[PDB]
């Protein structure tokens, strides 16, 4: 029982700015991830367990970066690739984000174990970093993709093909945005903050700590402006924030630009090796 | 300023039957904020007008559920589900979005 | 194939109410809005409404607003339209035509009017 | 409760001056503006003025501007209105109605017209 | 004897930009202030008297940061919390700013005593830092809140609740803005500048000086653009600057954005420990 | 809303000869995106209208090459290269750029 | 079979912003290139082969910088200099860019030889850096200027003289933009990336490497936003991206501003001597 | 020198088609558009079309659109114009006049109308 | 499009005396760039029109100094200092700023 207002397409400057950001991210990320992965996984290898975690992070970033040209082409021109490629792109996009977030959480947990229980807990650290990590990160990330696996497809609108998510009704997107927030931002954030609080307390009463702290803060500083955009969009959807429709278009543009800028989490990983390493 | 025409001017209604009054504006009643500020009044003979519904559909506290309104853009309508013997009087629709506020022509509800 | 099937023709007295079903099949019903178009006999085609099957964001034409409520039945993939307080000149033919496109990131309205229903005629006597 | 009480009905000769009191009680008088509305007998309701009790930022309607000065008495929480050079058609009923909302960071004008005074009638003879 | 022009609501970009700034400030400040306060006040403790002053600054910053979610919700949606919470929010907001400013002034005064009268004046420094500081900062800050305690309340406008300051008439806000300026900017600024001038003169004829100088300059650089906004608003109010009303709306938006940006004074304190410390 | 006038109202045509129908708008049919959404329908007597060409010139799949359209701005034209005996019926031009959509007056094609 | 839409002139801010950028670039580049060239080529000389490559880069940058005042005057006022000066300006502009890009490619190739085949390949390095470089860079750069040599001329439009490129038809500019991309961005980029990958692999299984890596990344970071502008313009020209005409004007303004900003490649070379050297 | 030469005068029956050549010499033909202007006898000069010789981006006037197709022959540096379904009032004189300016970075349209062809007259009988 | 009215329609002039023709537009002839593109033509009987002055005041090469023009905004005027026996013919004023270009009504100069 409400009137509809139709979303208007992005401005021309946005239509030009998204492809260049995507191209820069692709060019940086492909080279950085290829180099780090190759060195870590083929010759010199890794001295420390944290480098092992970083390898999984690099693989996830590479998997994400592979799909960027499709994003740029869709942003500029129409969709031509096909339904299967649409599904694969959406599946990979959903996998990589959760994989990266849970790898970060695992790194924080390993730090916690390395700091407080250093003497007692070497065997648990090795076991967690060797065997448990697969079940911890790769299984739930794969499992969370079933909604995309069903509801992502290409639709024929006149002569234009659209690759998007076609949900049965409105509330599904609200539920999926809520799980996105709860699994990306809140729970791993709680774990990371609690772990670092305990390490700080123990220290009060380290080069490794600094290097893994900068990665996490830089990751969540990039992702933070996106999640307020999603939170507000969800509240607007549930008739809790009825500020009009110009506000809706503005927040849609904000979401688009902010995710485009936050795609830097794949590029951030290899740089820290160049600077800090 | 914004000018609103209200129809019908005279609306004979029979007891126990619904009735509708609709007034049309000359400029879209949409605020920059995103709402529409149009409210309806009823003036019984010999006393000051009172407020029935504020905004397009929200109901002012203290009136029965029979009165209800709807509309959007430049067209608005107020409807009474059941007409009793105490629903006789003038009805006005006014807007508060553009300085200054403008009232309506007025509709008188008789008994048929 | 994609197709829309309507109900039969109806005749009703003035002041009554009429509801016309619009069953759609051959495509995902929850990703295209539906617009209701009425053609008066011996007159130009006219528009009176549109409902989004995605989340029920109805919209009405100015000339008919206040007398029509139109809703969808997503479970059986059907779209209805209710008209009350019929007048003498309402005798016409009603067409149910797919309109728009609704999605998670795309909710435009300039892609449609492609497939039409068989149409039904209603008269007042 | 919140209420507004006015003065009695008055009759005055043409060319005179009339002031109608509007005493308000039941709420903070210095946080809501007051708008003066006049209804001519057998005619549609009309607007003629508005004063902000916060800092006395008066405003007048075009049709009556130049003949009305309206002020407030914050000490006793009353609002007045003075009209001079009365004409023959000025016989009508004047209503004092709360309007707007004035605050330190919020000074909007689309929140009001809720409570009205009893109204007073003035005639010219 | 003037015509009124009504304030128009902030732009949609502002409605989205204020919540994200508030959320970032809250997330940074809560963690930083919790950590600094916990370490200083529960285990390792503080080696130097300046750290003791910084603890009061941290407590004031924490008290301010606690109330940010209400600010964000009010900025986005309507007020729902109630009259008592409105009063408490305003009281805490008024307390924290003055507390921080006077703690900075006390730090400057302690520096002055530590530099010029180092040999003679150890007992006065200890007495001032142990006993006098409470009367100096916490008493006047509490005392200055009576105007907010009386004139801050929630008003019912139709179906929307508004938490604001409802003064008896116009001149009260001018007087209170003037005392705001005179107690935040001018008098502590005079004290700080005079003290640092005397220390500079004595030095001409220090790691600690550098660390406490950067904190003060960074504090007043954040607060400076707000006070010109207030000064101009007060002059416009007293019919001294009659530039129209579009100028009034522009300066209102400037005040809003500038206070939103200047809320960084709570976040600035813990960072200096990470960098300089 | 946008109003479109279609000419001619009645177009007698002889078998084997081309014919043209043109409709003019009252507002430029250019979308912010950069396209023009104006499409033509044909309604045979007793059945629902079908789509012939979508947008100014693109041809809907399933119709012969005889039908073709052109135009830009506020002037559009549809032309039939050869008229057979099955090209008898009403023809409409409508726009989908400005809410709400508006149809055309209608043109009937006879046989001469 | 399409309708034309005529290009609209740049905004006033652009008309003021281009001359100041051009003047700053000219003032920086003339002094920097004069100094580096003078020292390298007249007295102290060059200790290392890389400095020799840098001298060619400096000469190319100087040749480019010489023509900037004509660009600024044309941007502001009408063309007055004449047909021969128009041709010379276009020829020099086309020469300098390709010369710089191929000198960078040669530097990368020399690095590759210096790293992997250091013991075996000193004589090839000397021969390549002494004799082959002229044929490698200066010959093809001169050869690629024949299209400009024919199709660049000044046209008399009423009382205004226009110095531009007047091609026989549309497809020529598409072909020349494609060769621009293929010879500036793609092929030298492939060579540089492959060479650095091999050096990185060998190292895993150097001050000089860092200094010549920063020059290349800073060069392609400046040139990158221009080439997406060209790519999109070419696709729009071939009726592959029909987004309208406001998009066309926006991308034209983007191309203009981006080339104005990317002209910094001449200024970047001498600075690295001041900072890193 | 720069000059434009046209064909001879023609007479054609109603419903026919006429093509008028416009040969240009003395300047680079592929850097200036051509606009076709028609002057009815005893009437004000009128405009009907424009074609860009750079890439054939034709444009037509509203009054004549749908009956004229105009193209260029870059190989021999000539510009044509075809008009079909001639009416009775089409008897007039057609002038081929250089217009605009087309280049790699400059494609403006307010530089021209300088040199005109000799003109040709066509009549319908 | 822009419509320009030219006055007078017929201007009898005596040899050796100046004369003025002025045409007024319906929209301001100011381009975004900052110039005004309005130019005047003269058409002798039996030959194609030639250009006399381009823009408001600039003189086309090849004509005497007698012809001169001025004006700004929406009002423009062309004046001939001395009228000889070879100044007989039609005169037009046209604009090139807004697509499409529009000509003038036309003024004929006789001999009196
Ligand atoms: C600390 C956090 C900083 C994070 C900023 C992230 C980027 C957010 C910018 C995306 C905004 C989308 C644009 C937008 O809202 O468009 C419009 C408003 O935009 C404008 O006109 C200019 C405002 C955006 C430019 C501000 C630049 C930010 C500073 C760099 C909405 O109005 P309409 O609907 O009438 O077009
Ligand atoms: C050194 C000090 C730098 C401090 C800057 C602090 C932030 C101040 C920006 C807040 C301005 C509020 C926006 C404003 O004035 O709005 C409007 C003007 O704003 C605009 O259109 C763009 C100007 C603001 C953007 C400038 C960005 C600053 C550089 C970063 C007023 O016009 P209207 O009433 O018609 O909307
Ligand atoms: C990481 C890559 C960052 C690279 C950015 C390079 C500079 C690109 C800016 C050039 C844009 C040209 C201006 C433009 O598009 O103009 C117009 C849009 O421009 C605007 O109104 C404001 C947008 C440009 C200002 C954004 C400032 C960027 C941040 C610094 C098009 O609209 P219309 O046709 O109606 O005028
Ligand atoms: C340091 C980094 C994060 C700053 C990032 C700033 C970028 C994201 C900002 C700077 C200027 C902004 C642009 C300014 C103006 C416009 C025009 C408007 O009609 C659409 C949005 C658009 C195109 C904005 C998009 C976002 C934008 C490009
Ligand atoms: C302008 C853009 C494309 C430049 C992109 C440069 C990035 C991708 C380059 C710059 C410096 C590079 C790093 C330099 C050193 C190392 C250490 C090595 O043991 C693993 C690879 C690694 C970590 C490199 C990865 C790629 C890297 C980060
Ligand atoms: C459809 C797609 C996205 C499904 C993703 C599944 C595949 C591509 C993913 C799932 C788990 C991943 C593996 C997880 C862990 C490791 C160990 C590491 O030392 C090398 C990479 C390697 C071996 C990964 C390779 C990629 C991988 C096999
Ligand atoms: C909108 C998005 C792209 C903004 C992304 C901003 C992120 C990447 C920026 C914001 C503040 C930055 C940090 C500011 C201060 C420091 C301290 C320094 O000793 C190391 C770098 C480090 C840790 C920076 C890393 C990058 C950083 C986290
Ligand atoms: C380094 C830091 C201090 C820079 C801070 C810049 C911020 C405060 C500036 C940058 C761009 C600005 C925005 C630019 C455009 C608009 C649109 C206008 O209609 C309302 C104000 C608004 C939304 C501005 C608000 C302030 C703003 C967001
Ligand atoms: C992206 C945002 C949320 C990151 C916020 C990080 C801030 C809150 C973190 C980064 C580094 C941290 C500091 C690191 C070291 C110390 C020293 C210790 O003896 C007291 C706490 C203190 C002073 C920490 C306080 C919190 C701190 C400043
Ligand atoms: C309504 C609210 C804002 C009233 C504020 C009063 C309370 C919360 C304030 C007033 C003075 C403050 C105290 C001032 C000094 C110290 C000493 C320090 O070593 C620990 C914190 C402590 C003990 C503060 C705790 C908070 C405190 C007790
Ligand atoms: C509008 C508001 C947010 C702007 C806030 C700007 C403040 C925080 C910035 C402006 C200039 C900055 C200073 C510039 C230079 C230096 C010197 C360096 O050796 C230490 C940091 C220090 C002291 C900076 C600290 C942060 C600083 C004070
Ligand atoms: C760090 C460097 C690369 C930032 C470079 C930003 C420059 C190129 C950006 C910043 C603001 C931009 C301007 C913002 C607004 C306008 C007005 C518009 O009508 C024409 C473009 C124009 C004039 C833009 C041109 C590009 C511009 C000047
Ligand atoms: C504001 C602008 C104009 C300042 C421009 C300053 C530039 C041109 C100056 C600043 C420092 C200078 C460099 C300083 C040192 C050296 C080392 C010498 O062996 C060769 C010249 C060289 C490399 C100089 C070249 C010119 C240079 C880069
Ligand atoms: C019309 C213009 C652009 C033609 C360019 C040709 C001339 C100016 C160019 C072509 C090749 C260039 C030479 C290439 C190599 C060297 C060796 C170096 O150690 C000194 C400069 C010097 C000697 C260059 C001087 C400039 C040069 C001779
Ligand atoms: C639009 C154009 C002008 C933007 C040009 C940006 C270029 C010149 C900027 C973007 C990122 C910058 C790099 C960012 C980080 C580093 C690492 C530091 O240890 C040396 C400088 C260096 C290598 C910078 C050099 C300049 C750089 C490459």
């Amino acid at each position: 029982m409400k009137e509809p207002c139709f979303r208007e397409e992005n401005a021309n400057f946005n239509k030009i700015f998204l492809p260049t950001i995507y191209s820069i991210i692709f060019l940086t990320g492909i080279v950085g991830n290829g180099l780090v992965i190759l060195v870590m996984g083929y010759q010199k290898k890794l001295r420390s367990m944290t480098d092992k975690y970083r390898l999984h992070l690099s693989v996830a970033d590479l998997l994400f970066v592979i799909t960027l040209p499709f994003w740029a082409v869709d942003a500029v021109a129409n969709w031509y690739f096909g339904n299967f490629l649409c599904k694969a792109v959406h599946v990979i996009y959903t996998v990589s984000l959760y994989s990266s977030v849970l790898i970060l959480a695992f790194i924080s947990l390993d730090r916690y174990l390395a700091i407080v229980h250093a003497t007692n807990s070497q065997r648990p650290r090795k076991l967690l970093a060797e065997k448990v990590v697969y079940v911890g990160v790769w299984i739930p990330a794969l499992l969370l993709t079933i909604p995309d696996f069903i509801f992502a497809n290409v639709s024929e609108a006149d002569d234009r093909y659209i690759c998007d998510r076609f949900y049965p009704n409105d509330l599904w997107v609200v539920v999926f945005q809520f799980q996105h927030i709860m699994v990306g931002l809140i729970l791993p954030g709680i774990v990371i903050l609690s772990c670092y609080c305990i390490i700080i307390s123990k220290l009060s009463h380290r080069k490794a700590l600094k290097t893994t702290v900068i990665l996490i803060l830089a990751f969540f500083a990039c992702w933070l402006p996106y999640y307020i955009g999603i939170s507000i969009d969800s509240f607007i959807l549930l008739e809790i924030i009825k500020q009009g429709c110009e506000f809706e278009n503005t927040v849609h543009k904000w979401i688009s630009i902010t995710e485009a800028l936050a795609f830097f989490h794949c590029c951030l990983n290899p740089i820290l090796y160049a600077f800090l390493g | 300023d914004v000018v609103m025409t209200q129809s019908p001017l005279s609306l004979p209604v029979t007891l126990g039957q619904p009735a509708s009054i609709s007034c049309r504006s000359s400029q879209s009643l949409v605020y920059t904020d995103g709402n529409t500020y149009l409210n309806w009044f009823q003036q019984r003979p010999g006393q000051s007008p009172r407020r029935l519904i504020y905004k397009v559909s929200n109901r002012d506290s203290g009136v029965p559920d029979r009165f209800s309104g709807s509309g959007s853009g430049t067209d608005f309508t107020l409807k009474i589900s059941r007409v009793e013997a105490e629903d006789v009087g003038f009805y006005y629709c006014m807007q508060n979005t553009h300085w200054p506020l403008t009232f309506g022509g007025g509709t008188k509800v008789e008994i048929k | 194939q994609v197709q829309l099937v309507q109900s039969g023709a109806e005749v009703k007295k003035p002041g009554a109410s009429v509801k016309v079903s619009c069953k759609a099949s051959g495509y995902t019903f929850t990703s295209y809005g539906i617009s209701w178009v009425r053609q008066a006999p011996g007159q130009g085609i006219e528009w009176m409404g549109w409902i989004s099957t995605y989340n029920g964001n109805r919209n009405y034409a100015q000339k008919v607003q206040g007398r029509v409520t139109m809703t969808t039945d997503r479970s059986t993939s059907t779209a209805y339209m209710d008209l009350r307080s019929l007048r003498s000149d309402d005798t016409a033919v009603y067409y149910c035509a797919r309109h728009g496109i609704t999605g998670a990131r795309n909710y435009y309205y300039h892609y449609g009017m492609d497939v039409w229903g068989q149409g039904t005629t209603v008269t007042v006597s």
Side-chain angles (χ1 to χ4, degrees), chain A, chain B, chain C:
Chain A
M1 297 308 184
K2 65 179 73 66
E3 307 215 330
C5 62
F6 300 114
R7 199 211 301 245
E8 57 183 359
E9 311 200 90
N10 274 32
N12 297 318
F13 193 90
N14 282 338
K15 283 195 204 111
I16 302 166
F17 185 52
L18 266 68
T20 181
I21 289 294
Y22 289 150
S23 298
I24 291 168
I25 289 165
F26 170 79
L27 284 174
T28 302
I30 190 61
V31 177
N33 296 283
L35 272 192
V36 54
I37 291 172
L38 156 79
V39 187
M40 286 326 169
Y42 182 76
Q43 36 182 358
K44 184 184 286 172
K45 316 189 172 183
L46 66 175
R47 296 105 61 88
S48 92
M49 202 92 68
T50 290
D51 276 317
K52 180 187 267 297
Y53 275 121
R54 271 160 159 288
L55 199 151
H56 299 91
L57 189 39
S58 289
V59 172
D61 294 331
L62 181 49
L63 282 180
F64 184 14
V65 166
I66 283 300
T67 62
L68 279 186
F70 307 100
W71 284 72
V73 159
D74 168 2
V76 178
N78 293 339
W79 189 259
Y80 299 123
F81 298 90
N83 189 359
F84 175 72
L85 271 184
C86 178
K87 289 188 187 293
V89 160
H90 277 268
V91 162
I92 294 172
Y93 167 52
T94 306
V95 160
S96 55
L97 164 63
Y98 293 171
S99 296
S100 76
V101 175
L102 309 193
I103 297 299
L104 284 185
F106 291 167
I107 296 171
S108 297
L109 203 169
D110 173 281
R111 295 299 91 187
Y112 177 21
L113 268 178
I115 299 299
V116 298
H117 309 122
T119 301
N120 184 341
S121 66
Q122 168 202 326
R123 174 271 204 170
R125 269 181 60 188
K126 179 266 291 184
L127 176 65
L128 167 50
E130 182 65 26
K131 184 152 111 153
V132 161
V133 60
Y134 298 92
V135 173
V137 65
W138 296 113
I139 297 297
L142 271 173
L143 184 63
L144 280 148
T145 62
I146 323 184
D148 264 346
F149 184 76
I150 301 153
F151 306 132
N153 72 21
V154 59
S155 176
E156 302 145 300
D158 278 350
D159 44 8
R160 200 215 163 176
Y161 297 136
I162 308 188
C163 165
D164 189 358
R165 284 211 211 71
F166 289 91
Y167 287 128
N169 64 7
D170 206 311
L171 272 43
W172 285 99
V173 70
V174 166
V175 176
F176 294 142
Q177 271 168 13
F178 283 170
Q179 66 182 357
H180 187 160
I181 288 175
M182 295 296 172
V183 180
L185 192 63
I186 290 177
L187 299 179
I190 289 312
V191 174
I192 293 165
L193 272 68
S194 66
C195 290
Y196 282 138
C197 298
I198 312 197
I199 296 90
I200 286 292
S201 87
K202 187 82 191 283
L203 280 199
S204 306
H205 181 72
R206 310 308 211 73
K207 277 282 287 186
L209 200 73
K210 308 322 271 163
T211 183
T212 85
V213 170
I214 297 169
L215 175 53
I216 292 166
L217 321 179
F219 182 76
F220 282 112
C222 298
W223 276 115
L224 202 48
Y226 178 51
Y227 286 145
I228 296 89
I230 294 299
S231 297
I232 295 184
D233 185 44
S234 310
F235 287 128
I236 292 170
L237 214 49
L238 309 171
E239 309 212 67
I240 291 191
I241 301 185
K242 59 179 71 66
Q243 292 266 333
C245 194
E246 288 182 352
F247 183 57
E248 203 166 4
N249 290 344
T250 293
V251 66
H252 283 325
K253 280 186 261 303
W254 171 283
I255 287 174
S256 174
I257 301 299
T258 300
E259 71 174 1
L261 296 175
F263 277 173
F264 290 166
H265 67 77
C266 54
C267 284
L268 291 153
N269 189 4
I271 281 176
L272 265 71
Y273 273 93
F275 290 164
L276 315 173
Chain B
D1 42 4
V2 177
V3 50
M4 317 200 142
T5 61
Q6 184 173 358
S7 65
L9 188 153
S10 179
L11 190 151
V13 71
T14 300
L15 291 171
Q17 294 271 330
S20 293
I21 318 174
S22 70
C23 65
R24 179 206 295 300
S25 171
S26 200
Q27 188 154 359
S28 71
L29 277 296
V30 279
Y31 202 55
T32 45
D33 188 359
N35 289 254
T36 294
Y37 300 96
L38 180 137
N39 46 2
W40 294 77
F41 294 116
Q42 158 181 278
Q43 163 193 31
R44 307 267 181 72
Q47 309 102 348
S48 49
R50 58 202 279 277
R51 208 195 207 173
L52 297 168
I53 64 155
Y54 69 89
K55 291 182 182 179
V56 177
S57 70
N58 304 56
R59 183 151 71 279
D60 188 292
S61 88
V63 298
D65 57 328
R66 320 191 264 118
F67 307 101
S68 297
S70 58
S72 286
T74 67
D75 206 350
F76 310 88
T77 302
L78 179 136
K79 60 181 72 66
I80 301 101
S81 176
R82 280 85 57 85
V83 171
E84 291 217 330
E86 58 97 23
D87 291 331
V88 184
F90 285 81
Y91 291 80
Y92 307 96
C93 72
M94 62 145 268
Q95 56 96 6
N96 217 25
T97 54
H98 303 157
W99 196 252
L101 59 92
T102 300
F103 271 82
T107 296
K108 175 181 44 144
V109 174
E110 293 166 294
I111 294 301
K112 193 58 61 196
Chain C
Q1 73 278 31
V2 292
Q3 68 201 29
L4 262 64
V5 187
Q6 303 194 220
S7 61
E10 323 186 350
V11 54
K12 293 182 183 293
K13 326 299 180 163
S17 296
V18 68
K19 184 191 301 323
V20 291
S21 65
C22 171
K23 177 167 211 329
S25 87
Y27 64 95
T28 64
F29 179 74
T30 68
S31 79
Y32 298 91
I34 287 178
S35 174
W36 278 84
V37 170
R38 187 269 298 164
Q39 161 174 350
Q43 207 141 338
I45 278 175
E46 287 197 46
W47 186 73
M48 45 184 278
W50 185 82
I51 188 168
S52 176
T53 48
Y54 192 49
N55 48 21
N57 292 320
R58 91 290 187 279
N59 190 308
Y60 301 139
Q62 188 271 330
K63 186 173 91 73
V64 179
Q65 179 156 43
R67 327 190 292 121
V68 285
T69 177
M70 45 182 302
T71 180
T72 63
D73 196 323
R74 196 256 298 192
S75 169
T76 178
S77 87
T78 61
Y80 301 104
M81 181 215 58
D82 192 1
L83 169 50
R84 62 190 48 91
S85 173
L86 282 72
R87 293 132 69 74
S88 159
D89 53 54
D90 186 74
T91 63
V93 177
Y94 293 73
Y95 292 102
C96 174
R98 182 165 80 186
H99 191 210
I101 179 163
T102 65
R105 286 291 172 90
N106 290 318
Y107 183 77
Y108 314 113
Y109 71 100
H110 41 267
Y111 300 120
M113 280 317 199
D114 183 349
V115 294
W116 295 52
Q118 54 174 240
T120 80
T121 179
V122 308
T123 180
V124 303
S125 52

